[PDB]
Amino acid sequence: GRGAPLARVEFRHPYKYRRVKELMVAPEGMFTGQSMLCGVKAPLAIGNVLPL
Amino acid sequence: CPRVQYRRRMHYATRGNRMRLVRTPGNRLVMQKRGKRSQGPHTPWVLGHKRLAGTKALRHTKARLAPRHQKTTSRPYGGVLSHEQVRDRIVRAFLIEEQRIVKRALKAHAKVQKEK
Amino acid sequence: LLRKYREEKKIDRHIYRELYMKAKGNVFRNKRNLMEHIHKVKNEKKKARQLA
C-alpha cells in the first residue's frame, strides 16, 4: 500500500541497557551498514536529521 | 492398487498433515503421519541468514532432549555467528580502539607544543 | 563423453573448452559425429607438431 520503502535503524537506549529499533521513510541513497546521526551537532550529509 | 483412509481424526491435506504409505507385516497398506521438519539454526537475518555448520536441525521436543554439543561450537559465539563474522568483530574491536588511542596522544602533544 | 576423454587425458583442457561450447551450440548430431571431429582434431594437431 505504500510506494516509498522503509528503513530499520537501530539505536542504543539513552538511559537503559537495551536497544531501540525505529522505522523511518528511506531517502534515496540509503544503504545497509550506513551510519545515521541525529542531533544539533550532526554534520550535513544525506540521511542525517538536523534542526531546520 | 489398494486404496487407503485417514487413520487419525483429521482429514485435510495441509502442510502439517502429511502422510506416507507403509506396508505392514500383515500385507496391508496403511497411512502413517510424517512429522514436520525444522529449518535448523541460522545466522542473523540482517547478516545474510545462512545455515550454521556443526549444528543439527531439530524440532521442539528433540531439541530439548538433545545434548548441548549437537547445537553449538566450542568457539566464542558458538551457535550464533559463523567464523567469518567472529573474525570481523575481533579485528574491528582492536583496530578501532588503537585509532582512538592514537588521536588522544596526538591532541595532547599538540597542546604541549602550543604551551611552548 | 567430453568429461570421460579429459579424465583419460586423450584431450587437453583447451580442446575440451572449445568442444564443450560447440555441443551446447548444436554442432554435433550424435555421438559418432563428435568422435569423428575429435579424431580429425587429433590428426592435424599431430601433423603440426611433427612439422615443428
Binding site: G3, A7, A26, E28, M30, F31, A45 | - | -
Partner: protein, 89 residues
Amino acid sequence: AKRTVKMGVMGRYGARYGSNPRKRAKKLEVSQHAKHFCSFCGKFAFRRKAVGIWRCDGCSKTVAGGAYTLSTPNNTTVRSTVRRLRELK
C-alpha cells in the same frame, strides 16, 4: 532482432493495449530488469526487489533507489549540491 523486428520484450502482449502505450512501457521495463553497476564492489550485479529496493548479487548490499532505475537523475544533482554546501562550512 532475429525473433522479432521491433516489439522486443513487449511481444508477450500480442495485439492488445495499443502501440504507443506498449512503447512507453518498454523503456521502463527494460531498465527495471537490467543489471546495474555497484560502486561498493565494482560489479554489474544490482537487481530490483520490489519497487525502490535494489540488492547486489556480489556483496549482498541493499540500497533504496528509484522505482525503475537504480539512480534517478534528480538524485545526482542533490548529492553534489549537499557535498558542496557541507564543505562550504
